[PDB]
A paper describes a structure:
The mucin [name] is a transmembrane glycoprotein expressed by epithelial cells at different mucosal surfaces including the breast tissue, airways, and gastrointestinal tract. The full-length [name] heterodimer consists of an extracellular domain with a variable number of tandem repeats (VNTR) of 20 amino acids, which are heavily O-linked glycosylated, a non-covalently attached SEA domain, a transmembrane domain, and a cytoplasmic tail with signaling capacity. Peptide mapping experiments have revealed that many such monoclonal antibodies target a similar region within the VNTR of [name], resulting in the definition of an immunodominant peptide corresponding to the subsequence APDTRPAP. One such antibody is [name], a hybridoma monoclonal antibody that was raised against human breast cancer plasma membranes.
To better understand the molecular basis of [name] binding to the immunodominant epitope within the VNTR, we determined a crystal structure of the Fab fragment in complex with the synthetic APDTRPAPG peptide (without N-terminal biotin or peptide linker). Crystals diffracted to a resolution of 2.5 Å, and a structure was solved using molecular replacement with a ColabFold model of the [name] Fab. The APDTRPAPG peptide binds diagonally across the cleft between the heavy and light chains, making direct contact with all CDRs, except CDRL2. Contact points between the peptide and the [name] Fab include hydrogen bonds with the peptide backbone at six of eight positions. Both the aspartic acid and arginine residues within the epitope make salt bridges with side chains from [name]. Although D3 interacts with R99 within CDRL1, R5 interacts with E50 and T59 near CDRH2, in addition to a stacking interaction with Y100 in CDRL3. The interactions of [name] with R5 via residues E50/T59 in the heavy chain directly flank CDRH2 but are formally part of the framework regions, and both positions are mutated compared with the inferred germline precursor. Two additional framework mutations in the heavy chain, that is, Y35 and T97, appear indirectly involved in [name] binding by positioning CDRH3 through hydrogen bonds with N106 and the backbone of Y111, respectively. The crystal structure reported here shows the T4 side chain to be pointing outward from the [name] paratope with no indication of potential clashes that would preclude binding of the epitope with glycosylated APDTRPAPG at the T4 position. Although monoclonal antibodies SM3, SN101, and AR20.5 all bind to the same immunodominant epitope of the VNTR as [name], the peptide is either shifted or oriented in the opposite direction relative to the cleft between the heavy and light chains.
Residue numbers in the entry:
A (entry chain L): 1 to 219
B (entry chain H): 1 to 135, 143 to 195, 201 to 222
C (entry chain A): 1 to 9
Amino acid sequence: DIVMSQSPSSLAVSVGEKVTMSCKSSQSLLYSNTQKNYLAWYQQKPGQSPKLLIYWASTRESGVPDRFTGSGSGTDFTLTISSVKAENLAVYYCQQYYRYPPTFGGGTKLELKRADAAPTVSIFPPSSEQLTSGGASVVCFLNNFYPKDINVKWKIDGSERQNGVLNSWTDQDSKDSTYSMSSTLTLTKDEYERHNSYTCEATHKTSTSPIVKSFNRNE
Amino acid sequence: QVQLQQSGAELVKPGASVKLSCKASGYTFTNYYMYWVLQRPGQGLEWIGEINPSNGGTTFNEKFKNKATLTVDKSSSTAYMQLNSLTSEDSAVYYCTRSRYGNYVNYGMDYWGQGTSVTVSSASTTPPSVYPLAPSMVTLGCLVKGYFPEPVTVTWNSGSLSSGVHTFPAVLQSDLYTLSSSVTVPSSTVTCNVAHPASSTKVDKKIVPR
Amino acid sequence: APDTRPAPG
């Protein structure tokens, strides 16, 4: 198969910026002396089907504004949005039709740039309702941080714990352009009741030291 | 005018088959190759195969040789894709799509169906357990655990509280789904409202500080 | 050279 590589996978932009995203191909998509390059660009917004923007590397599908510009030749292609609008925030895929199977790139997601924001971090004991099921979930919310890169680390009585941890990340918020994350440490009820201190440590670019939130089961 | 109408969502057990449909209108069906494309949850796009609706000839991706069968009914302008020996790896949204033809290739998939969600698990319909998460501005939450299938809806005070809500994507834990919702409010009751339509479930948990 | 197809119809 031809492999289509898009860089970067994620790109933060401002309304009004010029934006270039890149697409590289493992074989030449240029046929001979025809000056035709067998490459297309698609847009996908969340919960919608993909929309064709560009084909033959540089020709725009009808009804696509000229704010979108395809170019390149052979193996190296780019898509440019000359003046980004909010309605342009999406994933963009490239796709070759030089050879079967047709193959897509991995996509480049366009997000909105904003000022850095530290996570608000909250930790929650298991409810007594839940302890009754003989499982025990400790939840930790990390809310309204920017940028989206973050790590959560769990500690039980001081000792890191990696098993039974489940994380869930929101897409960029439409109100404030932040991200949020939920982390859940899942234990048996027996194990939960054998330990006293539960800690949730967040590492984010806004803080030189981790953000630590804990509770003691007896308190 | 041009329209691809795909069939309803699908929920099936491992080893089953589905036959998805894709009714085409607004153009001469037989004059465009029909492509099928899948998108696994939170992932990219992958081509499955093509059918030439005028003679019914097909080509598949190596990866879907035995997985998929493509056909058409010309008299109803419908393309069909059947999937066999279904694993949970095959849970995804499946698109049918019209390609434009020119210079001897299909150069652009210009109209897409809305997609068809196929979900493959051996789980059965299960209502969620709903647990409270109790602690100037304060945050509370609501853990929604062990339910099948998607989705659930979470609201806070019956819609009253719309500010400061994060409902997180569901996550798979023992073939059943779990999600969390948080809500932030000032200092002085809050109630989370979970609906699981599949199990005719509505449940209101009061969040009791401390 | 591209993988080619005949026109549908």
